[PDB]
Coordinates of C-alpha atoms and ligand atoms in Angstrom, one line a residue:
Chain A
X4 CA 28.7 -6.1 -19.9
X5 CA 26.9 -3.3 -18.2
X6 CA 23.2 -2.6 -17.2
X7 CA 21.1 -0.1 -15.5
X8 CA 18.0 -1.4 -13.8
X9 CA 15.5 1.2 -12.3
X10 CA 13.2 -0.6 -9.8
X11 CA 9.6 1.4 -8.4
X12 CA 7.6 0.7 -5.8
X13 CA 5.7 2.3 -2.6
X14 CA 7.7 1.1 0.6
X15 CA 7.7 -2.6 1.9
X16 CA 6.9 -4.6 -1.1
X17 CA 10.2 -6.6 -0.9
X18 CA 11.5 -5.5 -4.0
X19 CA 15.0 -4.7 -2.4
X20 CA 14.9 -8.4 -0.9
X21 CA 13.8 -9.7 -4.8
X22 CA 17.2 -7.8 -6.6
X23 CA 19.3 -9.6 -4.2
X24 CA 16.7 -12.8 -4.6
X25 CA 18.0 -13.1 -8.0
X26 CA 21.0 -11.5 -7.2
X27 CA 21.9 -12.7 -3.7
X28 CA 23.7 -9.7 -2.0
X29 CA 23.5 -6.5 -1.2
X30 CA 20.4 -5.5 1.2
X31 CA 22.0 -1.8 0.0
X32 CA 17.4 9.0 -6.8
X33 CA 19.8 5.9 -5.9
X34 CA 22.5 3.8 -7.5
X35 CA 23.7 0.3 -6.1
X36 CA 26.1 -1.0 -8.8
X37 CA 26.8 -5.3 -8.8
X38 CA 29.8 -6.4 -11.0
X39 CA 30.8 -10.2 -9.4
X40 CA 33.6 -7.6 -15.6
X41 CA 29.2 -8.3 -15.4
X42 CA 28.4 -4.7 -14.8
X43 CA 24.8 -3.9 -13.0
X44 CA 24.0 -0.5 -11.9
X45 CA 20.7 -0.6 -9.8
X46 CA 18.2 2.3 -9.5
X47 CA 16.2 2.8 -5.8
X48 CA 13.9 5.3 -5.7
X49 CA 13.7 6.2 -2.1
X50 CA 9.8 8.3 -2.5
X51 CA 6.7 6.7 -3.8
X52 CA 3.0 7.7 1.2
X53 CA 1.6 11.1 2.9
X54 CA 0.1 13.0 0.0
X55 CA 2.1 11.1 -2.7
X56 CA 0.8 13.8 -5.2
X57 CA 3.0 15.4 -8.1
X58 CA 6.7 13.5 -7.6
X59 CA 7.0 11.6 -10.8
X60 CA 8.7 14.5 -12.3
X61 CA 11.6 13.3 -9.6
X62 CA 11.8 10.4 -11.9
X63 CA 11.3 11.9 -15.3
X64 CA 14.0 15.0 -14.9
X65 CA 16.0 11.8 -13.8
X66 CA 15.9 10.3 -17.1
X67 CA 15.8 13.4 -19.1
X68 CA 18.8 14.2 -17.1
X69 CA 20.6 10.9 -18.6
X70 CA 19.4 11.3 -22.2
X71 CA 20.3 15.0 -22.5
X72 CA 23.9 14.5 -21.0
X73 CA 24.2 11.7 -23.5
X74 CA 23.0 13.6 -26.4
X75 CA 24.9 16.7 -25.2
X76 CA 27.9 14.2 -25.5
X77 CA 27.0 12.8 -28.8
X78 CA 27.2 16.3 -30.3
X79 CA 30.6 17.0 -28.3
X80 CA 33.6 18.3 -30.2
X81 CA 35.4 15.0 -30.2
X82 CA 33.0 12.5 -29.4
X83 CA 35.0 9.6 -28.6
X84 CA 34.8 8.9 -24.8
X85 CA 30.7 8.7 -23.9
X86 CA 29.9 6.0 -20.8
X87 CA 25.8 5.2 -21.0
X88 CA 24.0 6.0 -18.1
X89 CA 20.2 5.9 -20.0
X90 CA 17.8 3.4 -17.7
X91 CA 17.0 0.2 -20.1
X92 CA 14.1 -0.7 -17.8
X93 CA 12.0 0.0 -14.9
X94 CA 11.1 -2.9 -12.9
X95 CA 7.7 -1.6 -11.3
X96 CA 5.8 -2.6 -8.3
X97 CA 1.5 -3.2 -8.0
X98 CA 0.2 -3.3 -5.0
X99 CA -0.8 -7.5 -4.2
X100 CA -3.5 -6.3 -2.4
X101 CA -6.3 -4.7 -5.4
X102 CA -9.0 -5.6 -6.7
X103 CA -7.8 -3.0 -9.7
X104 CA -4.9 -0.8 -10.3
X105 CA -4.2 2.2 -8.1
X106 CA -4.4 5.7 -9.4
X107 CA -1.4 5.9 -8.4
X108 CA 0.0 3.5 -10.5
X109 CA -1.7 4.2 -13.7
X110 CA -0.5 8.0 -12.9
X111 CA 3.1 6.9 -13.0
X112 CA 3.2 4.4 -15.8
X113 CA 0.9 6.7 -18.7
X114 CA 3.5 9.0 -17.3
X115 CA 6.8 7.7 -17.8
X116 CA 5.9 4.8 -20.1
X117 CA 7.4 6.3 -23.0
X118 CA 10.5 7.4 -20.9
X119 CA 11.6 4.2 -20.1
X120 CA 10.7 0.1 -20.5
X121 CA 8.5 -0.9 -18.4
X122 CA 7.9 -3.7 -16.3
X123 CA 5.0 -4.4 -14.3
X124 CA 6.4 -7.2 -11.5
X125 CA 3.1 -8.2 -9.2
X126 CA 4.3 -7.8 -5.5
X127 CA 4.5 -10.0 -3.2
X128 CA 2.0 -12.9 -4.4
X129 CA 2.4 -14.9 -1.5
X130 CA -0.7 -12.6 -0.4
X131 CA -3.1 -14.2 -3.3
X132 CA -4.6 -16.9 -4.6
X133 CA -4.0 -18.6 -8.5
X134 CA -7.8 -17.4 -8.9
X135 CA -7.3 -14.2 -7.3
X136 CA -4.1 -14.0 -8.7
X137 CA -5.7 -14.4 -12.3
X138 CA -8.8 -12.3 -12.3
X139 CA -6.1 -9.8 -10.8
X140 CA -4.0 -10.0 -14.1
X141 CA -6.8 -10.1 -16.4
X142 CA -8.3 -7.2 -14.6
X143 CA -5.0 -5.1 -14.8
X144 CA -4.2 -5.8 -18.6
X145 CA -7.7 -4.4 -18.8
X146 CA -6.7 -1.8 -16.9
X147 CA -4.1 -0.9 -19.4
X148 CA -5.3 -1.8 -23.0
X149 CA -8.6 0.3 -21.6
X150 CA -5.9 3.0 -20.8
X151 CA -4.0 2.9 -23.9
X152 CA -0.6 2.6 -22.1
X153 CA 3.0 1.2 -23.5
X154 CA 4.6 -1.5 -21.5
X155 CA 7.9 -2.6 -23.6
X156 CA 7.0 -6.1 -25.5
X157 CA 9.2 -8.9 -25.9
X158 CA 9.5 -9.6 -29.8
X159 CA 11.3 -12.8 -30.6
X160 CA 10.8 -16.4 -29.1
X161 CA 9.3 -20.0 -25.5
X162 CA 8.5 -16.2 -24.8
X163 CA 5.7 -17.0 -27.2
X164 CA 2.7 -17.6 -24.2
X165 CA 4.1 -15.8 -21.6
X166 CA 3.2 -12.7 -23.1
X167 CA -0.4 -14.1 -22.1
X168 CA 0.9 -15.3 -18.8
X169 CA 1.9 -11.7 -17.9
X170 CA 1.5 -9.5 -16.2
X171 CA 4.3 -10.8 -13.9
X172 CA 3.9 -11.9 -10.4
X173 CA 6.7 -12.6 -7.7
X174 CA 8.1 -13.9 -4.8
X175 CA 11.4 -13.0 -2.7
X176 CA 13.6 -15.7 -2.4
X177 CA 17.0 -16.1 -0.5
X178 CA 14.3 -18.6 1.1
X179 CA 16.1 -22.0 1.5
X180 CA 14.5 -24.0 -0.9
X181 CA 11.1 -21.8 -7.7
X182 CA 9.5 -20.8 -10.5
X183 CA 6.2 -23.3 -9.9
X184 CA 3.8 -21.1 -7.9
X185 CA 5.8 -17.7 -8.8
X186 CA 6.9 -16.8 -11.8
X187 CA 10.2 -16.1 -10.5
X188 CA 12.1 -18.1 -12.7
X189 CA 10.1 -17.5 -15.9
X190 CA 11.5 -13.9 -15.3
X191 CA 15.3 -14.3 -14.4
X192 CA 15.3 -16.3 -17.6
X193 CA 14.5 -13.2 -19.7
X194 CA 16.5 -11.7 -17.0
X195 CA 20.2 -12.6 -17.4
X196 CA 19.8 -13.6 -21.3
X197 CA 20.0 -12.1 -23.8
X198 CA 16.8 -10.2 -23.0
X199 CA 18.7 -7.5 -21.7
X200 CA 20.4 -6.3 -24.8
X201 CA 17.1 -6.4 -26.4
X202 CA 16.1 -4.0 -23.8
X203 CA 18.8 -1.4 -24.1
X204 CA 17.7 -1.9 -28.0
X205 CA 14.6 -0.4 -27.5
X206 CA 15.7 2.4 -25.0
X207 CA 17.9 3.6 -27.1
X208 CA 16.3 3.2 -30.5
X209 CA 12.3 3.5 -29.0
X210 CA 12.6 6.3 -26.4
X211 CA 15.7 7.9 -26.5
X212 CA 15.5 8.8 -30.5
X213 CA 11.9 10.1 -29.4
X214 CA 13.4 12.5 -27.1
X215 CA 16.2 14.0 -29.3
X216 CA 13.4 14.8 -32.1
X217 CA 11.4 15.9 -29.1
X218 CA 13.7 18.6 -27.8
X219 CA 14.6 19.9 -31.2
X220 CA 11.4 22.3 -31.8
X221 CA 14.7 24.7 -31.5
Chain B
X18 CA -28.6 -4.6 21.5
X19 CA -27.0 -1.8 19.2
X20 CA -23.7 -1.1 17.9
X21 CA -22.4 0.9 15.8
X22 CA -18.9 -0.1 13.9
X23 CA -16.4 1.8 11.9
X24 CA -14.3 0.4 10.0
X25 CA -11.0 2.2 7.9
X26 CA -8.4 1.2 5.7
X27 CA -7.2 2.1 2.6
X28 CA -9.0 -0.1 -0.3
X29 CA -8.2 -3.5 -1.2
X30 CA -7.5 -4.2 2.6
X31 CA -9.7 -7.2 3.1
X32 CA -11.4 -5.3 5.3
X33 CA -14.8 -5.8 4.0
X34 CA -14.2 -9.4 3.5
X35 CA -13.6 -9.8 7.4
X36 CA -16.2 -8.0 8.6
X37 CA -18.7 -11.1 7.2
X38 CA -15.8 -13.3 7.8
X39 CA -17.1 -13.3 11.8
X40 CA -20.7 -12.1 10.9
X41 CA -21.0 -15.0 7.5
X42 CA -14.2 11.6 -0.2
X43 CA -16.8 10.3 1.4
X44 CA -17.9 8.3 4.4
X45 CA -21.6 6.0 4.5
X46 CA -23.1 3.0 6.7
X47 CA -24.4 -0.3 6.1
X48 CA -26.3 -1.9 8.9
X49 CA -27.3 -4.9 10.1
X50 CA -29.6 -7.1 12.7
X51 CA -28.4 -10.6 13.0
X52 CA -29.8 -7.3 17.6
X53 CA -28.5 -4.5 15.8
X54 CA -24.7 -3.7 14.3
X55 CA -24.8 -0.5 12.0
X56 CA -21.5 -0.7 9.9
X57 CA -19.5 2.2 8.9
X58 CA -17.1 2.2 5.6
X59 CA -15.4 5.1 4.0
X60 CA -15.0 5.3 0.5
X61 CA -12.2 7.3 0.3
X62 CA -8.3 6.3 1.9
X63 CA -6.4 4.4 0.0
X64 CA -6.8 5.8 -3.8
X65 CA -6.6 9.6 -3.8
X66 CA -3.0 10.0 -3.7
X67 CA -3.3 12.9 -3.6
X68 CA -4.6 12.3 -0.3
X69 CA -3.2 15.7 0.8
X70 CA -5.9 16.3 4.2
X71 CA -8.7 14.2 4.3
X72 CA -9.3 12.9 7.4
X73 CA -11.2 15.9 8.1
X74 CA -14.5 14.2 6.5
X75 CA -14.5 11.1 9.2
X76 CA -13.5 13.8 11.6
X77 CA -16.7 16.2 11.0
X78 CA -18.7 12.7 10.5
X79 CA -17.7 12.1 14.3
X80 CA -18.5 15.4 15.9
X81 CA -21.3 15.2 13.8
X82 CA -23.1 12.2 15.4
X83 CA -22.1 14.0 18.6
X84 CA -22.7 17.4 18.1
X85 CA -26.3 16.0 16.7
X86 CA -26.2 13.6 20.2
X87 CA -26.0 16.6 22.4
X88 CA -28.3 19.0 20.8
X89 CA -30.4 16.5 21.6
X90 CA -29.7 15.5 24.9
X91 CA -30.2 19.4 25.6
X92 CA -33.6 19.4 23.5
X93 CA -36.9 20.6 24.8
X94 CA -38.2 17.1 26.1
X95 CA -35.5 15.1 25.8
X96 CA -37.1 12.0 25.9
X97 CA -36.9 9.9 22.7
X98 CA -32.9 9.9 21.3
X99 CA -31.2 7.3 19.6
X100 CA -27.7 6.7 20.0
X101 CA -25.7 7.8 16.7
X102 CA -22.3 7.6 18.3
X103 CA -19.1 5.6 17.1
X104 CA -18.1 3.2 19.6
X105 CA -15.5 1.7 17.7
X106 CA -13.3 2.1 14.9
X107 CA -11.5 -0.9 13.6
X108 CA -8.4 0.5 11.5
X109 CA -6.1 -1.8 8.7
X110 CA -2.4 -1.0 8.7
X111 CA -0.8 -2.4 5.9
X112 CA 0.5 -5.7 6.5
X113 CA 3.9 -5.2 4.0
X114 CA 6.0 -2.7 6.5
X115 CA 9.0 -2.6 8.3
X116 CA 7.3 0.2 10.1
X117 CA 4.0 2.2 10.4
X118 CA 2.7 4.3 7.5
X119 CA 2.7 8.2 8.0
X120 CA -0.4 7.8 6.6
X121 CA -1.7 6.2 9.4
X122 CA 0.7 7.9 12.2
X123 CA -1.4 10.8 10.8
X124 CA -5.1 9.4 10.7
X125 CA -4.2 7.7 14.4
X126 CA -2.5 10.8 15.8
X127 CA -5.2 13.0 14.7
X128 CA -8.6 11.1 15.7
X129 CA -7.5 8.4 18.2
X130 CA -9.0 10.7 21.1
X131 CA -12.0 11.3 18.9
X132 CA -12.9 7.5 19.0
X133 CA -12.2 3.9 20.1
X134 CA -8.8 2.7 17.7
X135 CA -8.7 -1.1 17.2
X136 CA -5.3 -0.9 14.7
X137 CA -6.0 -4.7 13.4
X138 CA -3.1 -5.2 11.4
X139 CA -3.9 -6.4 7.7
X140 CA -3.7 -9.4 5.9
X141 CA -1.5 -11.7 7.7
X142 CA -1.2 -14.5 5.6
X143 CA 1.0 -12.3 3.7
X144 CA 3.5 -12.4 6.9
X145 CA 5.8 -14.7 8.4
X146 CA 5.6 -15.2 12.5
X147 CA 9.2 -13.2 13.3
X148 CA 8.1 -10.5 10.3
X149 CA 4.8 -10.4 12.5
X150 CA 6.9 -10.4 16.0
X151 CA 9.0 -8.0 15.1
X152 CA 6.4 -6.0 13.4
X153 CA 3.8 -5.4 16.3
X154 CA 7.1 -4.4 18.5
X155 CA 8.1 -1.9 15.8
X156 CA 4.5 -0.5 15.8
X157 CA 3.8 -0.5 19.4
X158 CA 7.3 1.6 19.7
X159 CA 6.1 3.7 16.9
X160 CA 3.4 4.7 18.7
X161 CA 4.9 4.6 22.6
X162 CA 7.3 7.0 20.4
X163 CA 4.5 9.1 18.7
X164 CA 2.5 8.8 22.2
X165 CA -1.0 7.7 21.2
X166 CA -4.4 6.4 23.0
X167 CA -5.7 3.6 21.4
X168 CA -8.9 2.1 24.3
X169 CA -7.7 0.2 26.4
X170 CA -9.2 -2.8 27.6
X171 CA -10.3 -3.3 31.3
X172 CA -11.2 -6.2 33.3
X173 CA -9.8 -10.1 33.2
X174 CA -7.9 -14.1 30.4
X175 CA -7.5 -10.5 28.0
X176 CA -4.6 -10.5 30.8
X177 CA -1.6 -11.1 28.8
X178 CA -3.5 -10.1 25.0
X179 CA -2.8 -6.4 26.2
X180 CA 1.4 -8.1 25.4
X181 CA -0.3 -10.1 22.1
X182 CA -1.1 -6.9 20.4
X183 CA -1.7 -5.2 17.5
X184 CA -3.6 -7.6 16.6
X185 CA -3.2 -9.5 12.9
X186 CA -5.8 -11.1 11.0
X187 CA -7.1 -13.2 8.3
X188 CA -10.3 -13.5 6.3
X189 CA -8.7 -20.7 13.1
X190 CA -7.5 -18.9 16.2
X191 CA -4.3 -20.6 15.5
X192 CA -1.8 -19.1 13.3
X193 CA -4.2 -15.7 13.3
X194 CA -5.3 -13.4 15.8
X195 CA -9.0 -13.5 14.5
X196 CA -10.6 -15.8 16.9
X197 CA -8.7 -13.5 19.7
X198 CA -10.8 -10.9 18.4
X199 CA -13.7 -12.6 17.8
X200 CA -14.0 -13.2 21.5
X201 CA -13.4 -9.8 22.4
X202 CA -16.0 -9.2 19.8
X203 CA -18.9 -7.3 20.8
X204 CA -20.8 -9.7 23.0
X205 CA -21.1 -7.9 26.1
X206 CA -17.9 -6.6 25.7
X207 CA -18.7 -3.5 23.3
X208 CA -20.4 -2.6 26.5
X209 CA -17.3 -1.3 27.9
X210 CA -16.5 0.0 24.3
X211 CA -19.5 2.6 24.5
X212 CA -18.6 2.9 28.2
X213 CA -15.7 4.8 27.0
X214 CA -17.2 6.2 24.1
X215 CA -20.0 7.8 26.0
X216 CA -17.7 8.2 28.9
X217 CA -14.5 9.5 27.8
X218 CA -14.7 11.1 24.4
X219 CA -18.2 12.4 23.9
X220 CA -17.4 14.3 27.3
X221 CA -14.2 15.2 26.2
X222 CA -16.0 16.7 23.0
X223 CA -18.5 18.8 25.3
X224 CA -16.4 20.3 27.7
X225 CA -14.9 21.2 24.5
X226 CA -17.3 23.0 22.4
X227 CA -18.4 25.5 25.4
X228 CA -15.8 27.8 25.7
X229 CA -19.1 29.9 24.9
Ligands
LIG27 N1 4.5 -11.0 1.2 C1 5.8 -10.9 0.8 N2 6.7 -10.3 1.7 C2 8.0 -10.2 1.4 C3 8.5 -10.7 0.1 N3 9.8 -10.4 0.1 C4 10.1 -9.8 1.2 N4 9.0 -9.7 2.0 C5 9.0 -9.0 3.3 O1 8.7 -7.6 3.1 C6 9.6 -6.8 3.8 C7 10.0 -5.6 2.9 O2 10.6 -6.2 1.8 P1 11.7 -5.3 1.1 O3 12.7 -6.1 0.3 O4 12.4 -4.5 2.1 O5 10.8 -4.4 0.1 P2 11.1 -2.8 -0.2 O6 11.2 -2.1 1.1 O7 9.9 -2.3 -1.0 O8 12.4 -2.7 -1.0 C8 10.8 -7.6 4.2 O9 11.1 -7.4 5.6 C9 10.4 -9.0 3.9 O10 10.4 -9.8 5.1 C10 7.5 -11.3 -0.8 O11 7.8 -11.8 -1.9 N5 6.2 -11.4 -0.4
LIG28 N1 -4.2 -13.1 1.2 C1 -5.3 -12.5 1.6 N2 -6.2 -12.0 0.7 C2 -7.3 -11.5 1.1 C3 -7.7 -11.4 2.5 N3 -8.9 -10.8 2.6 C4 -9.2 -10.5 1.3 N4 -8.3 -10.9 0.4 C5 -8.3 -10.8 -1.0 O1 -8.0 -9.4 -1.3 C6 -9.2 -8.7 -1.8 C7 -9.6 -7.7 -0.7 O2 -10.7 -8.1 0.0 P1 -11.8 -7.0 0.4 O3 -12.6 -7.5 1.6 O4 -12.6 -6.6 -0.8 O5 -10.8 -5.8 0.9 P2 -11.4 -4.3 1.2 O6 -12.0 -3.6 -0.1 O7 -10.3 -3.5 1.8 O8 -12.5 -4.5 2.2 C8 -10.3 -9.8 -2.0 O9 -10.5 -9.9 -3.4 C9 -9.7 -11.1 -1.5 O10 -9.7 -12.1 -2.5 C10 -6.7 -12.0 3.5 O11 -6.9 -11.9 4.7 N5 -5.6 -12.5 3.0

């Protein structure tokens, strides 16, 4: 089995801690790869404060780097031998504090939301309130559908009202003890199985497939 | 009594929240009598992103109140000014770090001798007591490092609170440092806040400006 996760965020929201909080290891563009014949590379991006303004490109070339090596291999004389380095998901990072949804934010994700999967963790909820945490939700999904964006949507089913209790909000745990307040669990569910093959499904089908007819115009 | 408060952060800092919580780009002023409090919020930090400068705008806002203060205070009869000045500015760091923010190691840095810098730290209930320790400690060697005034306070009881800062906050004395403040809240205490407002930088600023 192999995997490659790409996790966002602006510095300090304990994402690093929640990869291992699942995970439990590590406190490790950048690559951190778990096996423990289970196969996970791990994406840190080590940018997103100061001015903050263009780098996303960073990320995009990134990607674009990936698909276009793989195409460029899938057009090689003898194509046998091609590994797959393309990124089946970004795990991304809002700031627990808002009332709304950063520019920032809804910069990066109408940017790179075709590019990749993403997936729109809440940080660090042990900031908020279940009210807070719910107008907060609401207000983002708002947010989005009012910005027209493309977050990757789990299709089959169990899953079936937890596309209403998105977006996702988190907690880091090595903690010595919980999905009850978080939604931790409800995620490393549709983390280890089988969700992840779905995602790599869509990556490769969804966004890659739009890139090779993209780059074609010659 | 007057004062005249200003408080920055970047948005969705709890900020405004806190401010009632003891009293129940652009920049702008509420105000209040409850004795007299005018409040100061800025619009911008936070957002923006680009927030390449800024800064600049609280910056001219300052030397603006003064500049205005002294024209005055030089004015044909001098008799009748009012006191525009910012005594205090009560500043948000953001409560997730391991460190401190070049954002605000810029803002700090660049007005801290312009006004009085209360760096509350943000949010607290977000934290965890040795996250907080070892937070503060980071901080206060961040800035130790990056060499900084922040006002100092005087006098006597506040003996050992110079050691309990930065300060953290929540919007209960207990687990937060809000009743700590609180205390230290204006009362007559703001009177030594203006002392070295009036005192120290507003001086600082004249001497300044006359090199003609
Ligand atoms: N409020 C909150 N803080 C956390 C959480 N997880 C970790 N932290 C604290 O936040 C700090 C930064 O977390 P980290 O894993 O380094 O996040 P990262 O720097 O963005 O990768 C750590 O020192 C933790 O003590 C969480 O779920 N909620
Ligand atoms: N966990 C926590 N949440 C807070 C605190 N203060 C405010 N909030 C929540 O976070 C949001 C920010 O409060 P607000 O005063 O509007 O922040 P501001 O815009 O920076 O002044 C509010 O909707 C509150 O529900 C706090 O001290 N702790």
């Amino acid at each position: 089995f192999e995997f490659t996760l790409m996790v966002v965020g602006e510095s300090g929201l304990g994402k690093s801690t929640l990869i291992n909080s699942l995970f439990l290891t590590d406190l490790y563009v950048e690559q951190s790869k778990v096996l423990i014949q289970l196969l996970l590379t791990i994406v840190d991006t080590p940018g997103f404060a100061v001015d903050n303004s263009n780098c996303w490109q960073p990320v995009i070339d990134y990607i674009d780097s990936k698909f276009e090596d793989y195409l460029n291999a899938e057009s090689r004389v003898n194509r046998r031998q091609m590994p797959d380095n393309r990124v089946q998901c970004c795990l991304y990072f809002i700031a627990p504090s808002g009332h709304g949804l950063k520019p920032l934010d809804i910069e990066f994700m109408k940017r790179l939301h075709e590019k990749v999967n993403i997936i729109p963790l809440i940080a660090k909820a042990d900031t908020l309130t279940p009210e807070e945490c719910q107008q907060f939700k609401k207000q983002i999904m708002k947010e989005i559908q009012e910005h027209k964006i493309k977050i990757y949507e789990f299709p089959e089913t169990l899953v079936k009202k937890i596309k209403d209790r998105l977006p996702l909000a988190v907690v880091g745990s090595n903690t010595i003890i919980n999905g009850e307040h978080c939604d931790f669990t409800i995620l490393r569910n549709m983390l280890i199985r089988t969700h992840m093959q779905d995602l790599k499904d869509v990556t490769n089908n969804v966004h890659y497939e739009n890139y090779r007819s993209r780059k074609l115009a010659a």
